[PDB]
DNA sequence: GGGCATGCCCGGGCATGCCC
DNA sequence: GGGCATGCCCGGGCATGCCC
């Protein structure tokens, strides 16, 4: 399938993503490495992503998430839930990797041409006095799942899009869904330093 | 379910919550830690919460209370009474965690969209010469109840809302419902200091 | 409810129960203490019980299992699944504690007078050259479950009964359903020796 | 599901299984440990099993093969192909673990009561001057496949059955389907000696 | 109020298909 | 064939309603 752009596009609204701290304890549920721009998280647990903007987006703006493989040689393959976690799946079709929890207006899409999956929620401006809005994503496979990601790293691309379809902002982060997010983040940062 | 705001909003009326002293004796029925902004109380016993405001709110103002899980990964789950304390329950539906005692005008609500529970009483201005009004809450499960809170900490969010539905003030506090509130408060304060 | 007999009755068929060895490693799935005549096992995992007899029972013989509380003061209370594990239960009614896995002819009974639960399977003589037959029981609550056993020890009574209803043999064993069967068996044997 | 007998039954025909030597080189395709009575083989590759008997069985005799889990706590679960290798499967239904290659008279069965899978071929007496007959089995999942065997050891039970359905002989062997059969056999034999 | 209970948490380390 | 991978196993120890 055709490859969506992953290139950062901060646009005129100064769109940026924020992530909590939660540190590097062995199986913390979700931890983000700024050095690697990489979230590390457990399957089927909340991943909070914050949306920051410099100016208010117009009414009807939507926030899309889609996963693509990071490596050149996998980039044209659609990222999907492996057959085991699809089967004993359960709103979200069981073939989608990324879900949003807690949003009565979530739309799950399958592109009719590229067959790529995405999940979309409306943009809501932060609470009357606050600095960002948070969306709760869930990844429903480990990166290692045989017959899904199969140990291939992915990027999640978050785009902010007006109701006309215009791209307003785009940012992406690498994701590793694993049993021990603290162990693995520390290992990868230390590999970056040594190698 | 969508997550209600927990962010403190003191608003134009200077809404604030007050709590008694009762100190830290092992099984005091209730005790509040200002250091941790946290209530330690026993199940099905009164928890006095005082409402302070700087100016009188308009007539028809209502005070709502609602529990949400504190940790990111539980935040989208609705807080409910466990099945044991619901079954041998008894005005308040048996699935609600928080009750108000002693208020002939109490309303128990289940949001038709979020399915979250709340309990609401009208705002009454303090007695002709007094400084705050007190509402008597009861929590009907221990934080540890298997199949309800399951040891997950909760926040109680108190909102002051006009009869039109406008948010006038909001404050929240963490709650631990346990058998020995004095032991546990002391333990947590001491954990805060060392760790 | 009236108390069923727990008294060992070896009868004319020389009915006796046998149990595997599996030793005392911390969370072994099921381990039996001959010193205490006590099986220690995890919830919803197989518990193999072997049936030994000196002479062949007649055709139509059935093997019943029923749980009763061990302590005098609880003996008249019916042993049942707690409300949490009944609710998210699922052949076996969700109120029964003991199930049999793997037996197309299992009958679950609720006594119309005593309201006690039992599960019954036909007696099958051992395989053409073998020494006992094995039935795979499952206990669907921990002994500690709040609103079910509530930390009260139970006995499981196994009776061998002819198709006319006559009691042919009866033996019983104490059960503790817990998260760490190896830890707990060792602890109890050591308590027996010291105290 | 009810558990089939795994007990060796050499019967009146002196039925026994034979296995090649192929030694312990790291990724040999198949290798058999007589010490552990265990087959170590790669997925979807031939596993030769020889059938030896002391007297010729009558005409119409059939040889059935079936997998059951070895550990007590898994024994009542039906052994099946995981969803990944079933989906991209392909005579043999894609849910069966064990196939026979090279036998125009193979029957694949699913028991209507136990739902267990088996594969059956007719017994052929050895070639006019030979000592055993060989059947070529294939296992279509690794023992480690997530959502199939999931790292649980299995036994393969081979039964020799007359055309009337009578059991004539039965023998079983443990199987580990893995990427490196020579490594793993050596490792397990060495674990047996020390531990 | 001092202290046991017991399902769960926690980091050290095995697993095993794959990489090199 | 030597060695990394990464979900899981494992025992030491915290938890917290209850016992004493
Ligand atoms: Zn998966
Ligand atoms: Zn409760
Ligand atoms: Zn239970
Ligand atoms: Zn497989």
Chain D residue at shortest CA distance from C128: D9
| Cα angle B190-B193-B195, degrees, rounded to a multiple of 5 | 100
Q: H helices then E strands: how many in chain C? A: 2, 11
Length of chain C: 195
Longest Cα–Cα distance in chain B:
48
Mutation pick from C43, C82, C84, C86 vs chain B, by most beta carbons of B within 10 Å, is C84
The residue written with tokens 């963490």 in the block is B174
| Tokens found for residue A187 | 């290992």
Three-state SS annotation for D48-115: EEEEECCCCCCCCCEEEEEEEECCHHHCCCECCCCHHHHHCCCCCCCCCCEEECCCCCCEEEECCCCC
Distance CA D183, CA C91 (A): 44
Give phi and psi for B50, each to the nearest 5.
-105, 150
Distance of alpha carbon D101 from its chain centroid, rounded? Answer: 13
Distance CA B189, CA B39 (A): 12
| Tokens found for residue A40 | 């590390």
The terminus-to-terminus CA distance of chain C in angstroms comes to 33
Task: Report the relative pairing of strands A154-161 and A167-177 from DSSP bridges.
Answer: antiparallel
Check residue B74 and report its DSSP letter.
Answer: G
- What residue ranges define each of the domains in chain D, with the CATH number in brackets? 1-195 (2.60.40.720)
Q: How many CB atoms lie within 10 A of CB C132?
A: 14
| Cα angle A74-A79-A84, degrees, rounded to a multiple of 5 | 120
In what helix (H) or strand (E) does residue C183 lie, and over which residues does it extend?
helix C181-194
Check residue C96 and report its DSSP letter.
Answer: -
- Radius of gyration of chain D from Cα atoms? 16
* Helix, strand, or coil (residue D135): strand
| Tokens found for residue D174 | 């443990």
Distance CA C50, CA C39 (A): 13
Query: Residue A81 in contact with residue A96, Cβ under 8 Å?
Result: yes
Distance CA C19, CA C32 (A): 7
Q: Which of D2, D43, D49 is nearest to D171 (CA)?
A: D49
Q: Which residues contact D107 (CB under 8 A, 6 or more apart)?
A: D119, D120, D121
| Tokens found for residue A110 | 């399958």
Whole-number Cα distances in Å, C147 to B83, B87, C7, C71, C82: 9, 10, 28, 17, 5
Q: Give the DSSP letter string of chain A.
A: --PPP---B-TTTT-EEE-------TT-SEEEETTTTEEEE-TTSEEEEEEE-SSPPPTT-EEEEEEEESSGGGTTSBP---HHHHHT-----TT-SEEE-S-TT-EEEE-TTT--EEEEEE-----SS-S-EEEEEEE-S-TT-TTTTTT--EEEEEEEE-TTS-EEEEEEEEEEE-S-HHHHHHHHHHHHHH-
Whole-number Cα distances in Å, B149 to B172, B176, C26, D97: 18, 10, 28, 42
Distance CA B11, CA D66 (A): 72
| Alpha helix segments (H runs only) across C31-121 | 83-87
Distance CA A57, CA A169 (A): 10
| Tokens found for residue D154 | 């299995």
Query: Residue A19 in contact with residue A49, Cβ under 8 Å?
Result: yes
Query: Residue A92 in contact with residue A108, Cβ under 8 Å?
Result: yes
Q: Chains touching chain B at 3 or more Cβ pairs under 8 angstroms?
A: A, C
Query: Is the minimum CB–CB distance between C102 and chain D shorter than 8 Å?
Result: yes
| Tokens found for residue A20 | 């909590």
Q: How many CB atoms lie within 10 A of CB D60?
A: 11
Which residues in C lie closer than 8 A to residue B86 (C-beta atoms)? 83
Query: Residue C62 in contact with residue C122, Cβ under 8 Å?
Result: yes
The residue written with tokens 């009907």 in the block is B140
Query: Residue B123 in contact with residue B57, Cβ under 8 Å?
Result: yes
B46 touches strand F (CB under 7 A): no
Q: Give the DSSP letter string of C11-35.
A: TTTT-EEE-------TT-SEEEETT
Three-state SS annotation for A2-49: CCCCCCCECCCCCCEEECCCCCCCCCCCEEEECCCCEEEECCCCEEEE
Q: Which of C41, C46, C40, C49 is nearest to C16 (CA)?
A: C49
Q: Which of D185, D110, D184, D174 is nearest to D139 (CA)?
A: D174
Scanning D66-85 for CB atoms below 8 A from A yields 82-84
Query: Residue B100 in contact with residue B136, Cβ under 8 Å?
Result: yes
Q: Give the DSSP letter string of C150-169.
A: TT--EEEEEEEE-TTS-EEE
Distance CA B103, CA D79 (A): 60
Give phi and psi for A138, each to the nearest 5.
-135, 135
Distance of alpha carbon B18 from its chain centroid, rounded? Answer: 12
Give phi and psi for C175, each to the nearest 5.
-130, 140
Q: Which of A152, A189, A158 is nearest to A173 (CA)?
A: A158
Scanning A136-165 for CB atoms below 8 A from B yields 136
* Helix, strand, or coil (residue C111): coil
Q: Is B117 annotated as a binding residue?
A: no
Distance CA B178, CA B42 (A): 5
Distance CA C38, CA C143 (A): 13
Give phi and psi for D50, each to the nearest 5.
-105, 150
Q: Which residues contact D69 (CB under 8 A, 6 or more apart)?
A: D75, D77, D79, D149, D152, D153, D154, D155
Query: Residue A123 in contact with residue A160, Cβ under 8 Å?
Result: yes
Q: Which residues contact C121 (CB under 8 A, 6 or more apart)?
A: C62, C63, C100, C103, C105, C106, C107, C135
Which residues in A lie closer than 8 A to residue D145 (C-beta atoms)? 146
Q: Which residues contact A166 (CB under 8 A, 6 or more apart)?
A: none
Q: Which residues contact C178 (CB under 8 A, 6 or more apart)?
A: C40, C42, C142, C143, C144, C184
Does chain A touch chain B (at least 3 C-beta pairs within 8 Å)?
Answer: yes
Q: Which of A129, A110, A107 is nearest to A120 (CA)?
A: A107
Q: Which of D95, D70, D76 is nearest to D148 (CA)?
A: D95
* Helix, strand, or coil (residue C117): strand
Query: Residue C76 in contact with residue C1, Cβ under 8 Å?
Result: yes
Q: Cβ–Cβ of D145/A145 closer than 8 Å?
A: no
Check residue B9 and report its DSSP letter.
Answer: B
* Residue B5 Cα, gap to closest chain A Cα (Å): 8
Distance CA D50, CA D59 (A): 19
Residue D110 β-bridge partners: D117
Sign (positive or negative) of CA dihedral A123, A80, A112, A5: positive
C182 touches strand F (CB under 7 A): yes
Distance CA D26, CA D175 (A): 17
CA within 13 Å, CB half, A52:
9
Longest Cα–Cα distance in chain C:
48
Query: Residue C185 in contact with residue C51, Cβ under 8 Å?
Result: no
| Tokens found for residue D122 | 């007719």
Length of chain B: 195
Distance CA A147, CA A154 (A): 15
Q: Cβ–Cβ of B2/A129 closer than 8 Å?
A: no
Q: Which of D14, D12, D17, D8 is nearest to D54 (CA)?
A: D14
In what helix (H) or strand (E) does residue B155 lie, and over which residues does it extend?
strand B154-161
Q: Cβ–Cβ of C147/B84 closer than 8 Å?
A: yes
Check residue D11 and report its DSSP letter.
Answer: G
| Tokens found for residue A91 | 């709103």
The terminus-to-terminus CA distance of chain A in angstroms comes to 33
Distance CA B181, CA B138 (A): 14
Check residue C9 and report its DSSP letter.
Answer: B
Distance CA C126, CA C120 (A): 18
Q: Cβ–Cβ of D82/A84 closer than 8 Å?
A: yes
Which residues in B lie closer than 8 A to residue A127 (C-beta atoms)? 5, 7
| Cα angle B19-B20-B25, degrees, rounded to a multiple of 5 | 120
Distance CA A133, CA A135 (A): 7
Q: Is D180 annotated as a binding residue?
A: no
Distance CA C1, CA D119 (A): 52
Query: Residue D68 in contact with residue D159, Cβ under 8 Å?
Result: no
Distance CA B131, CA B54 (A): 10
Whole-number Cα distances in Å, D67 to A119, A192, D75, D109, D152: 42, 46, 10, 13, 12
Distance CA B110, CA D57 (A): 73
| Tokens found for residue B33 | 């830690």
Q: Mark the residues whose beta carbon lies below 5 A from ion ligand 2.
A: B 82, 85, 141, 145, 148
Check residue B72 and report its DSSP letter.
Answer: G
Query: Is the minimum CB–CB distance between C20 and chain D shorter than 8 Å?
Result: yes
Q: Which of C14, C8, C30, C7 is nearest to C181 (CA)?
A: C30
Sign (positive or negative) of CA dihedral D81, D83, D89, D91: positive
Distance CA B56, CA C179 (A): 56
Give phi and psi for B18, each to the nearest 5.
-120, 155
Query: Residue B83 in contact with residue C85, Cβ under 8 Å?
Result: no
Whole-number Cα distances in Å, D123 to A92, D25, D51, D135: 51, 32, 9, 10
Q: Which of D111, D103, D113 is nearest to D63 (CA)?
A: D103
Distance CA C158, CA C171 (A): 6
Residue C171 β-bridge partners: C158
**Rounded to 10 degrees, what is the CA torsion of C92, C97, C101, C105?**
-50
Edge-to-edge strands of the sheet including C38-41? Answer: C30-33, C38-41, C167-177, C154-161, C62-69, C117-122, C107-110
Task: Report the relative pairing of strands B167-177 and B154-161 from DSSP bridges.
Answer: antiparallel
Query: Residue B181 in contact with residue B41, Cβ under 8 Å?
Result: yes
Q: Which residues contact A101 (CB under 8 A, 6 or more apart)?
A: A46, A136, A137, A138, B76
| Tokens found for residue A39 | 């979230």
E strand map for C101-150: 107-110, 117-122, 133-139
Which residues in C lie closer than 8 A to residue D7 (C-beta atoms)? 127, 129-130
Give phi and psi for D139, each to the nearest 5.
-105, 130
Query: Residue B138 in contact with residue B42, Cβ under 8 Å?
Result: no
Query: Residue D59 in contact with residue D53, Cβ under 8 Å?
Result: no
């Amino acid at each position: 399938s055709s490859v969506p752009s992953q290139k950062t596009y901060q646009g005129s609204y100064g769109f940026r993503l924020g992530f909590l701290h939660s540190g590097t304890a062995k199986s913390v549920t979700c931890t983000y490495s700024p050095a690697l721009n990489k979230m590390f998280c457990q399957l089927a647990k909340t991943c909070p992503v914050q949306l920051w903007v410099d100016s208010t987006p117009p009414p009807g703006t939507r926030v899309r998430a889609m996963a693509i493989y990071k490596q050149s040689q996998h980039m044209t393959e659609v990222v999907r839930r492996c057959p085991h976690h699809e089967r004993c799946s359960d709103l979200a079709p069981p073939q989608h990797l990324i879900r949003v929890e807690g949003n009565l207006r979530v739309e799950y899409l399958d592109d009719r041409n590229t067959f790529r999956h995405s999940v979309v929620v409306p943009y809501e401006p932060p609470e009357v006095g606050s600095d960002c809005t948070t969306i709760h994503y869930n990844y429903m496979c480990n990166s290692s799942c045989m017959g899904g990601m199969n140990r291939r790293p992915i990027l999640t691309i978050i785009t902010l899009e007006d109701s006309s379809g215009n791209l307003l902002g785009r940012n992406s982060f690498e994701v590793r869904v694993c049993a021990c997010p603290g162990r693995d983040r520390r290992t990868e940062e230390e590999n970056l330093r040594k190698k």
